Amino acid sequence: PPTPHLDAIERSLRDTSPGLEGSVWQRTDGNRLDAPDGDPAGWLLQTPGCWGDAGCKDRAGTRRLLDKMTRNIADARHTVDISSLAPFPNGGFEDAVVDGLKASVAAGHSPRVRILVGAAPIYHLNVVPSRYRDELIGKLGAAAGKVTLNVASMTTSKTSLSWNASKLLVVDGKTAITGGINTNKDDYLDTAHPVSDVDMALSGPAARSAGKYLDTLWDWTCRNASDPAKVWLATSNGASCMPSMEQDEAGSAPAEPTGDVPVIAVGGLGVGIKESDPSSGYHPDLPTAPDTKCTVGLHDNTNADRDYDTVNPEENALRSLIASARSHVEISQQDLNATCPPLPRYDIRTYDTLAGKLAAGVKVRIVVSDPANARSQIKSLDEISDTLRTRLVALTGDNEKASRALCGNLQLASFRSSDAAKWADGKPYALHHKLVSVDDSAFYIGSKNLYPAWLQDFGYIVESPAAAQQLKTELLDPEWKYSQQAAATPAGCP
């Protein structure tokens, strides 16, 4: 089966981060999208799952998600590997972790279990690793004895704002859940106004891909627990740190296929883990596009740092995915722009890639979280359409060439999930996707935001017309049906 989008992407990843192939990024064949029998699109795990309902009474999406996490951990034979933004899994996320582990222990297994959270230098951890570990041990009861725990919170750069934001649940290196959904009960489960988000479930070689990525982070985490300012670590039963748990489980055996889906796993190492890819010949000429709204105090890793690209292939992977679009691009994000300062306002290359698509007649849709949320980082969606216009002029010369590209090919709106502008409690809709879909053939579902950020993130890029059709039917088309009544007509357009 031809994967023309994956191929372009792979080309860029190999040119950017050749040494990181097979740890921080990897293409594999033979994957399956882990849908429950009789629910073929059930691999797409959206929360909360209430299109057409501003009241959101039946959070079916959220319970499919929690039940899929529970079931996947319940099936664990050897390893469970969890990462998220802080806090550690709480509320129903914790329940799914505990419940699954008890099942695994009942079926006679002794699972090893790693749990990694990123934390900003500003963020105060209420439940620190030793308290989290103790809490799980109590909740596990008699089964704790069979469960080897590694619990850790990490910050990799204080001055350059880098910590883990990957959101992974990998089991036995065989199944993986990932997306934008943090294990934070208060955004998703305990509220009259839940965040909207999406994860995907998968099984096969690409689950091992995620595993080796987490090994890369645990290698750094284990080594740097010698510096409590960066890492807080707690193990149970007197266990060592486990930097290579996914590798141990994999062994010499190559991962067995479980379906026919081609996938590119790709993440990034942020700042402070590795300076550069020593084997990389990446030699871009980086844009010089000083921005109206902002200058950066901090050194701009997004727009002006060759080395940062070499140890962060997800950045260029997202740029390649957009660049691969021959027909149309759908972007659904919390934000395109970052709040600047401190971070650069936007990723110049992304916007240039998008402007180039606008000028070639490729259709571009951008849905972002409602600016009535700053959970958002722009005052008005004109910020995005203005930026695209400046970059269009910077490309085509004259304005009404850009206006022809912009006004004819751009859909831009804030996210709605029902006909209601907001929820019952008056709070607006918060969108937390990190999703890109291209030509109804290839899509990214993961944790890497399109706005500038220097965290460790990870996600999957799938090339499957049948899966993208499902993605289009279950998420993109509904989103646009409701979000177009919050759409912007860019300034200077009919």
Ligand X SMILES: O=P([O-])([O-])O[C@@H]1[C@H](O)[C@H](O)[C@@H](O)[C@H](O)[C@H]1O
Question: Closest CB to ligand X among 112 and 375?
Answer: 375
Residue with tokens 């309902």: 53
* Pairwise CA distance, residues 50 & 429, whole Å: 12
C-alpha separations of 394 from 289, 292, 357, 360, 397 in Å: 10, 14, 14, 15, 6
Beta carbon nearer to ligand X, 366 or 410: 366
Show the tokens assigned to 239: 């266990």
x/- map, 158-187, ligand X, by CB under 6 A: -------x--------------x-x-----
**What percent of the chain is helix, strand and coil (3-state, nearest 5)?**
35, 20, 45
Q: Tokens 């097979």 — which residue?
A: 22
Burial class (CB in 10 A: 0-12, 13-18, 19+), 493: middle
Nearer to ligand X, 185 or 472 (CB): 185
Closest CB 296 distance from ligand X, rounded Å: 16
CB of 335 to ligand X, least distance (A): 8
347 versus 463: smaller Cβ distance to ligand X: 347
Minimum Å distance from CB 343 to ligand X? 9
Q: Tell me the closest approach of the beta carbon of residue 449 to ligand X, in angstroms.
A: 5
Q: What angle do CA 377, 494, 331 make, to 5 degrees?
A: 35
Output the smallest distance, CB 353 to ligand X, in A.
21
Query: Nearest distance from residue 290's CB to ligand X, in Å?
Result: 24
Q: Does 375 bind ligand X (CB under 6 A)?
A: yes
According to the binding rule CB under 6 A, does residue 302 interact with ligand X?
A: no
Read off φ and ψ for residue 431, nearest 5 degrees: -105, 135
Residue nearest to ligand X (CB): 165
User: Which CB sits closer to ligand X, 204 or 270?
Assistant: 270
CB of 16 to ligand X, least distance (A): 22
Decide whether 149 or 176 has the Cβ nearer to ligand X: 176
442-481 residues in contact with ligand X (CB under 6 A) are 449
* Least separation in angstroms between CB 180 and ligand X: 6
For residue 342, give the 3-state DSSP assignment. Answer: coil
328 or 427: CB nearest ligand X: 427
Q: In whole angstroms, how far apart are CA 389 and each of 123, 174, 385, 490?
A: 37, 45, 6, 9
Q: Which residues contact 34 (CB under 8 A, 6 or more apart)?
A: 43, 68, 175, 201, 202, 203
Tell me if 345 contacts ligand X by CB under 6 A. Answer: no
User: Is the distance from CB of 449 to CB of 432 less than 8 angstroms?
Assistant: no
437 touching ligand X, by CB under 6 A:
no
With CB under 6 A as the rule, give the number of residues binding ligand X: 8
d(CA 188, CA 196): 8
> Between residues 372 and 493, which has the closer beta carbon with respect to ligand X?
372
Token pair, residue 94, equals 């914790």
* First CA to last CA distance, the chain: 42
Specify the residue, 337 or 449, whose C-beta has the smaller distance to ligand X. Answer: 449
Report if residue 432 touches ligand X, rule: CB under 6 A: yes
Alpha carbons 6 and 263: distance in angstroms, whole number? 8
Phi, psi of 232 (to 5 degrees): -115, 120
Task: Give start and end residues of each alpha helix (H) in 87-128.
Answer: 91-106
Interaction residues for ligand X, span 76-135 (CB under 6 A): 85
CB 453 → ligand X: shortest distance, Å? 7
The residues that touch ligand X, with contacts defined as CB under 6 A, are 85, 165, 180, 182, 334, 375, 432, 449
